[PDB]
Design an enzyme around this catalytic site. Structure first.
Site, mmCIF file in Angstrom:
data_model
loop_
_atom_site.group_PDB
_atom_site.id
_atom_site.type_symbol
_atom_site.label_atom_id
_atom_site.label_comp_id
_atom_site.label_asym_id
_atom_site.label_seq_id
_atom_site.Cartn_x
_atom_site.Cartn_y
_atom_site.Cartn_z
ATOM 1 N N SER A 391 0.905 -1.085 -0.109
ATOM 2 C CA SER A 391 -0.162 -0.248 -0.105
ATOM 3 C C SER A 391 1.021 1.260 0.018
ATOM 4 O O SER A 391 1.537 1.594 0.866
ATOM 5 C CB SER A 391 -0.975 0.044 1.215
ATOM 6 O OG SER A 391 -1.968 -1.160 1.300
ATOM 7 N N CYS A 559 -7.724 -0.813 7.105
ATOM 8 C CA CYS A 559 -6.535 -1.402 6.564
ATOM 9 C C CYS A 559 -5.921 -2.549 7.129
ATOM 10 O O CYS A 559 -5.426 -2.360 8.201
ATOM 11 C CB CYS A 559 -5.537 -0.528 5.868
ATOM 12 S SG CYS A 559 -3.930 -1.122 5.246
ATOM 13 N N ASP A 604 -9.355 -2.020 2.857
ATOM 14 C CA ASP A 604 -8.155 -2.543 2.092
ATOM 15 C C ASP A 604 -7.564 -3.717 2.845
ATOM 16 O O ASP A 604 -7.072 -3.549 3.607
ATOM 17 C CB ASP A 604 -7.222 -1.412 2.008
ATOM 18 C CG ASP A 604 -5.952 -1.759 0.992
ATOM 19 O OD1 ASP A 604 -6.604 -2.077 -0.114
ATOM 20 O OD2 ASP A 604 -4.831 -1.415 1.371
ATOM 21 N N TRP A 606 -5.323 -6.928 3.326
ATOM 22 C CA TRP A 606 -3.962 -7.795 2.873
ATOM 23 C C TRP A 606 -3.915 -9.100 2.992
ATOM 24 O O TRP A 606 -3.007 -9.484 2.362
ATOM 25 C CB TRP A 606 -2.894 -7.060 3.876
ATOM 26 C CG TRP A 606 -2.887 -5.518 3.728
ATOM 27 C CD1 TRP A 606 -3.452 -4.634 2.848
ATOM 28 C CD2 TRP A 606 -1.801 -4.746 4.272
ATOM 29 N NE1 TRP A 606 -3.114 -3.547 3.008
ATOM 30 C CE2 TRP A 606 -1.915 -3.223 4.043
ATOM 31 C CE3 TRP A 606 -0.933 -4.939 5.386
ATOM 32 C CZ2 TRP A 606 -1.034 -2.404 4.346
ATOM 33 C CZ3 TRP A 606 -0.052 -3.790 5.926
ATOM 34 C CH2 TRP A 606 -0.311 -2.642 5.316
HETATM 35 C C1 LIG Z 1 -3.778 -5.394 -1.682
HETATM 36 C C2 LIG Z 1 -2.456 -5.777 -0.770
HETATM 37 C C3 LIG Z 1 -1.531 -4.753 -0.021
HETATM 38 C C4 LIG Z 1 -0.485 -5.212 0.790
HETATM 39 N N1 LIG Z 1 0.017 -4.034 1.579
HETATM 40 C C5 LIG Z 1 1.165 -4.342 2.402
HETATM 41 C C6 LIG Z 1 1.950 -3.248 3.002
HETATM 42 O O1 LIG Z 1 1.713 -2.159 2.761
HETATM 43 N N2 LIG Z 1 2.992 -3.591 3.845
HETATM 44 C C7 LIG Z 1 3.568 -4.873 4.039
HETATM 45 O O2 LIG Z 1 4.295 -5.314 4.882
HETATM 46 N N3 LIG Z 1 2.641 -5.771 3.405
HETATM 47 C C8 LIG Z 1 1.855 -5.621 2.668
HETATM 48 N N4 LIG Z 1 1.095 -6.839 1.853
HETATM 49 C C9 LIG Z 1 1.289 -8.175 2.143
HETATM 50 C C10 LIG Z 1 2.621 -8.019 1.271
HETATM 51 O O3 LIG Z 1 1.978 -8.227 -0.216
HETATM 52 C C11 LIG Z 1 3.838 -9.133 1.080
HETATM 53 O O4 LIG Z 1 2.947 -10.482 1.171
HETATM 54 C C12 LIG Z 1 4.449 -9.525 2.598
HETATM 55 O O5 LIG Z 1 5.253 -8.363 2.762
HETATM 56 C C13 LIG Z 1 5.265 -10.481 2.541
HETATM 57 O O6 LIG Z 1 6.342 -10.852 1.258
HETATM 58 P P1 LIG Z 1 7.456 -11.761 1.118
HETATM 59 O O7 LIG Z 1 7.495 -11.872 -0.396
HETATM 60 O O8 LIG Z 1 8.422 -11.137 1.964
HETATM 61 O O9 LIG Z 1 6.918 -13.020 1.954
HETATM 62 P P2 LIG Z 1 6.585 -14.377 1.204
HETATM 63 O O10 LIG Z 1 8.068 -14.995 0.682
HETATM 64 O O11 LIG Z 1 5.577 -14.137 0.122
HETATM 65 O O12 LIG Z 1 5.904 -15.224 2.399
HETATM 66 C C14 LIG Z 1 4.500 -14.883 2.990
HETATM 67 C C15 LIG Z 1 3.993 -15.904 3.628
HETATM 68 O O13 LIG Z 1 4.496 -16.775 4.834
HETATM 69 C C16 LIG Z 1 3.727 -17.125 5.517
HETATM 70 N N5 LIG Z 1 4.046 -16.789 6.928
HETATM 71 C C17 LIG Z 1 4.350 -15.437 7.320
HETATM 72 N N6 LIG Z 1 4.818 -15.461 8.562
HETATM 73 C C18 LIG Z 1 4.629 -16.695 9.251
HETATM 74 C C19 LIG Z 1 4.766 -17.043 10.527
HETATM 75 N N7 LIG Z 1 5.186 -16.460 11.520
HETATM 76 N N8 LIG Z 1 4.471 -18.629 10.572
HETATM 77 C C20 LIG Z 1 4.158 -19.281 9.359
HETATM 78 N N9 LIG Z 1 3.876 -18.803 8.176
HETATM 79 C C21 LIG Z 1 4.068 -17.535 8.020
HETATM 80 C C22 LIG Z 1 2.510 -17.041 5.124
HETATM 81 O O14 LIG Z 1 1.695 -18.048 4.547
HETATM 82 C C23 LIG Z 1 2.485 -15.574 4.105
HETATM 83 O O15 LIG Z 1 1.629 -15.740 3.137
HETATM 84 C C24 LIG Z 1 -0.127 -6.575 1.229
HETATM 85 C C25 LIG Z 1 -1.017 -7.638 0.419
HETATM 86 C C26 LIG Z 1 -2.316 -6.904 -0.487
HETATM 87 C C27 LIG Z 1 -2.858 -8.399 -0.991
HETATM 88 C C1 LIG Z 2 -6.193 -10.299 0.415
HETATM 89 C C2 LIG Z 2 -6.959 -11.546 -0.197
HETATM 90 C C3 LIG Z 2 -8.412 -11.327 -0.237
HETATM 91 C C4 LIG Z 2 -9.149 -12.335 -0.645
HETATM 92 N N1 LIG Z 2 -10.716 -11.660 -0.720
HETATM 93 C C5 LIG Z 2 -11.563 -12.706 -1.139
HETATM 94 C C6 LIG Z 2 -12.931 -12.316 -0.908
HETATM 95 O O1 LIG Z 2 -13.496 -11.346 -0.745
HETATM 96 N N2 LIG Z 2 -13.826 -13.269 -1.680
HETATM 97 C C7 LIG Z 2 -13.635 -14.697 -1.966
HETATM 98 O O2 LIG Z 2 -14.442 -15.611 -2.369
HETATM 99 N N3 LIG Z 2 -12.219 -15.155 -2.021
HETATM 100 C C8 LIG Z 2 -11.258 -14.059 -1.512
HETATM 101 N N4 LIG Z 2 -9.846 -14.341 -1.533
HETATM 102 C C9 LIG Z 2 -9.531 -15.803 -1.895
HETATM 103 C C10 LIG Z 2 -8.679 -15.849 -3.375
HETATM 104 O O3 LIG Z 2 -9.907 -15.525 -4.181
HETATM 105 C C11 LIG Z 2 -8.451 -17.180 -3.744
HETATM 106 O O4 LIG Z 2 -7.358 -17.651 -2.522
HETATM 107 C C12 LIG Z 2 -7.901 -17.468 -4.955
HETATM 108 O O5 LIG Z 2 -7.636 -18.585 -4.994
HETATM 109 C C13 LIG Z 2 -6.437 -16.608 -5.206
HETATM 110 O O6 LIG Z 2 -6.309 -16.651 -6.698
HETATM 111 P P1 LIG Z 2 -4.933 -16.190 -7.513
HETATM 112 O O7 LIG Z 2 -3.594 -16.915 -7.135
HETATM 113 O O8 LIG Z 2 -5.384 -16.745 -8.953
HETATM 114 O O9 LIG Z 2 -5.033 -14.701 -7.119
HETATM 115 C C14 LIG Z 2 -8.794 -13.579 -1.070
HETATM 116 C C15 LIG Z 2 -7.364 -13.708 -0.916
HETATM 117 C C16 LIG Z 2 -6.317 -12.887 -0.393
HETATM 118 C C17 LIG Z 2 -5.181 -13.019 -0.250
#
Ligand SMILES: Cc1cc2nc3c(=O)[nH]c(=O)nc-3n(C[C@H](O)[C@H](O)[C@H](O)COP(=O)(O)OP(=O)(O)OC[C@H]3O[C@@H](n4cnc5c(N)ncnc54)[C@H](O)[C@@H]3O)c2cc1C
Ligand SMILES: Cc1cc2nc3c(=O)[nH]c(=O)nc-3n(C[C@H](O)[C@H](O)[C@H](O)COP(=O)(O)O)c2cc1C
Ligand SMILES: NC(=O)c1ccc[n+]([C@@H]2O[C@H](COP(=O)([O-])OP(=O)(O)OC[C@H]3O[C@@H](n4cnc5c(N)ncnc54)[C@H](OP(=O)(O)O)[C@@H]3O)[C@@H](O)[C@H]2O)c1
Length: 607
Positions: A391, A559, A604, A606
């Site tokens: 974000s 958020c 919003d 995450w």
């Molecule tokens: C619309 C949107 C906005 C976002 N905005 C922000 C933002 O402003 N700031 C921010 O920091 N992040 C934000 N995120 C989360 C961000 O996109 C990243 O996913 C996050 O920063 C980590 O990414 P990475 O690549 O470093 O981790 P990755 O290598 O992708 O690993 C993440 C995964 O590790 C696992 N995990 C994490 N901690 C643990 C734990 N303790 N134990 C077990 N499993 C764990 C989870 O399954 C998680 O999904 C946002 C996500 C979305 C969908």
């Molecule tokens: C931040 C986030 C928000 C989601 N919001 C919804 C939602 O409102 N409704 C729903 O049915 N699934 C929701 N899902 C689930 C995803 O639609 C589902 O995990 C999908 O498989 C992801 O597909 P992709 O890898 O093709 O993006 C959300 C997943 C994430 C990570």
């Protein structure tokens, strides 16, 4: 540039668009496209954003043509980023689609409130525009077993489609390997991909406009620790987008393409006993498929594993099935198959020992010594590395040439027994201004400030979820400085301890002292026996908040995590409205939910 024309030039009669953000729908789209050939037909999968969907009007020109949609649903039911344009278009248009045949399969998760909203929308919408539905709307649920849902849908889908266009299962044998290896003896260094996401050299020769396929490499002008303590690592980055022609607003997201930890890449190469520096290319065995390669080629193995493949997430059951054939030790081969099984207990071993323990491809290769698969077959089995979204924490009104990011480095001890590192955040935490370039593009959101500056704003963002709000504030402070009239601006933030991970203390003080921030409510969850959360503070301001909402017409923004925190906040607001209406809980819910549809309650999410 018209997908239809693209279809004619390659004899394709089936097109599958993927509305995806992390690859699931993309891969389903890829698999369905491949399927068409088993029925003597031809298809291709495609990113809807790279085309104009109004072109569906021309699909009827190809005999026996079909358009399939694999769409994922995100925050508040909004579409994935690559489907927003299509989604916006579906709402504007009134084009007559008589003659168009479609089928929709939506990816969702029943634990969120708007289950598969995007999938239901495309299916319903396309029928109103006059297109003909030839197979029922699939409703996958990532809460149960999404892959399973896809399979049982797909198995009825093809038979119904075949019955509709007059063909039948070709009865082909199959091929197992969708690609074959080709090693290069020379190769011109500038003819070999080094990490680019699209057009060769597109990374070195930055050329607008910049989007998902043509990311702009912004330089990191600032990267600093934000938290005082050392329990965790919170960082603040600033990327210069000067000369990129990129526009953004507060509330938007910035996506980045990270690079895997080079030490992890190395180890995989060693464990496979492979020369990561061999320049090669992987070509589709079926010379008729539209997917010539699994990713950019030619390229070295190192590059692929570093910039093109997911090597840190839990391996899919399919990967375990395929890899199984490479275990020279029977008991390990049997264990790999059991974890890929459909049996209840076989699906448990998997959920427990792989997914919940967070084991990645390397951990599996180490835990199964007899397992020695050729690296080229491994690279074809692994999913593509995805961009990470953040974000934007700044206002283009004040920083038109700089995108700010607020992030927490991810690093924990997995039940697998080792230490896992997050890809994007580890890569971001290593970028030192000294020029460190981050490939990125902007993705619009509907998390915007009020249309009119007078509308009061109520922000709720605990932890790093404060990120988008720093933007809102900068912008409101700027609007005031421009002699504009601005409504009240309230922030409800939370943290562990004030001396541990309180974010933006100074910047926040300045804004408050200047009147840009009307109220600065902060909760500390660990600085005492009692836990305090933003919703407790909202409850303490029940009178004023209700005033601003029922009389001031305030806008509300939240958020972070949707199903828990965002859920507790929504509940807290239900209570406030129920007390001050006064009305029954039942009626307070319709009132808060009416706010959302009315556009005054933005979320919003995450996760
Ligand atoms: C619309 C949107 C906005 C976002 N905005 C922000 C933002 O402003 N700031 C921010 O920091 N992040 C934000 N995120 C989360 C961000 O996109 C990243 O996913 C996050 O920063 C980590 O990414 P990475 O690549 O470093 O981790 P990755 O290598 O992708 O690993 C993440 C995964 O590790 C696992 N995990 C994490 N901690 C643990 C734990 N303790 N134990 C077990 N499993 C764990 C989870 O399954 C998680 O999904 C946002 C996500 C979305 C969908
Ligand atoms: C931040 C986030 C928000 C989601 N919001 C919804 C939602 O409102 N409704 C729903 O049915 N699934 C929701 N899902 C689930 C995803 O639609 C589902 O995990 C999908 O498989 C992801 O597909 P992709 O890898 O093709 O993006 C959300 C997943 C994430 C990570
Ligand atoms: N599902 C959730 O509600 C939730 C909330 C925060 C963070 N997280 C996860 O943890 C990681 C760290 O994130 P972060 O650094 O930004 O958060 P963080 O440091 O944990 O801060 C968020 C704040 O919210 C508190 N909190 C926890 N559950 C809450 C709820 N239901 N409603 C309101 N406040 C709640 C936290 O307190 P305590 O930690 O002391 O309980 C903390 O003070 C993220 O990757 C995220 O996925 C999840």
């Amino acid at each position: 540039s018209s997908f239809v024309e693209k279809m004619k030039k390659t004899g394709r009669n089936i097109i599958v668009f993927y509305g995806s953000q992390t690859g699931t729908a993309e891969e389903f789209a890829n698999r369905l496209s491949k399927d068409a050939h088993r029925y003597g037909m031809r298809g291709m999968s495609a990113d809807p954003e790279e085309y104009d969907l109004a072109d569906l009007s021309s699909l009827p020109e190809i005999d026996k043509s079909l358009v399939v949609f694999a769409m994922a649903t995100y925050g508040e039911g909004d579409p994935t980023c690559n489907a927003q344009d299509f989604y916006d278009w579906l709402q504007e248009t009134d084009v007559d689609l008589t003659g168009v045949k479609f089928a929709v399969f939506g990816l969702g998760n029943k634990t969120y409130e708007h289950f598969n909203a995007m999938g239901k929308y495309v299916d319903q919408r396309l029928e109103q525009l006059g297109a003909q539905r030839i197979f029922e709307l699939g409703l996958g649920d990532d809460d149960g077993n999404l892959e399973e849902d896809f399979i049982t849908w797909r198995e009825q889908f093809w038979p119904a489609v075949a019955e509709f266009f007059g063909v039948e299962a070709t009865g082909e044998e199959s091929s197992i390997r969708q690609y074959e290896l080709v090693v290069h003896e020379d190769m011109d260094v500038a003819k070999v991909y080094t990490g680019e996401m699209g057009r060769l050299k597109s990374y070195e020769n930055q050329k607008p406009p910049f989007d998902a396929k043509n990311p702009f490499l912004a330089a990191v002008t600032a990267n600093r620790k934000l938290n005082q303590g050392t329990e965790r690592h919170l960082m603040h980055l600033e990327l210069d987008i000067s000369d990129s022609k990129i526009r953004y607003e507060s509330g938007d997201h910035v996506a980045v393409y990270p690079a895997n930890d080079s030490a992890l890449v190395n180890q995989i190469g060693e464990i496979l006993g492979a020369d990561l520096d061999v320049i090669m290319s992987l070509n589709n065995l079926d010379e008729e498929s539209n997917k010539k390669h699994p990713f950019p080629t030619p390229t070295t193995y190192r590059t692929a594993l570093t910039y093109y493949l997911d090597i840190t997430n839990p391996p899919r059951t399919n990967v375990l099935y395929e890899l199984a054939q490479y275990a020279s030790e029977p008991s390990e081969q049997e264990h790999l198959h059991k974890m890929a099984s459909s049996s209840g207990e076989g699906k448990e071993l998997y959920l427990s020992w792989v997914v919940e323990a967070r084991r990645h491809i390397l951990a599996i290769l180490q835990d199964y010594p007899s397992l020695r698969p050729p690296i080229d077959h491994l690279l074809e089995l692994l999913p593509r590395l995805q961009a990470r979204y953040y974000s934007i924490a700044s206002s283009s009104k004040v920083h038109p040439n700089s995108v700010h990011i607020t992030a927490v480095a991810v690093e924990y001890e997995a039940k697998s027994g080792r230490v896992n590192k997050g890809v994007a955040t580890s890569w971001l935490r290593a970028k030192e201004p000294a020029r460190a370039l981050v490939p990125m593009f902007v993705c619009k959101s509907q998390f915007r400030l009020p249309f009119k500056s007078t509308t009061p704003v109520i922000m709720v963002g605990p932890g790093t979820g404060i990120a988008p709000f720093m933007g809102f504030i900068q912008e409101r402070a700027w609007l005031r400085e421009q002699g504009k009239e601005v409504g009240e601006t309230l922030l409800y933030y939370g943290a562990r301890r004030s001396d541990e991970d309180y974010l933006y203390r100074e910047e926040l003080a300045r804004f408050h002292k200047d009147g840009a921030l009307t109220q600065l409510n902060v909760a500390f969850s660990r600085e005492q026996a009692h836990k305090v959360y933003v919703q407790h503070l909202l409850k303490r301001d029940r009178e004023h908040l209700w005033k601003l909402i029922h009389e001031g017409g305030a806008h509300i923004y939240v958020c972070g995590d949707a199903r828990n925190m965002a859920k507790d906040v929504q509940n807290t607001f239900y209570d406030i409205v129920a007390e001050f209406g006064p009305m029954e809980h039942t009626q307070a819910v319709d009132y808060v939910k009416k706010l959302m549809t009315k556009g005054r309650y933005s979320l919003d999410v995450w996760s």
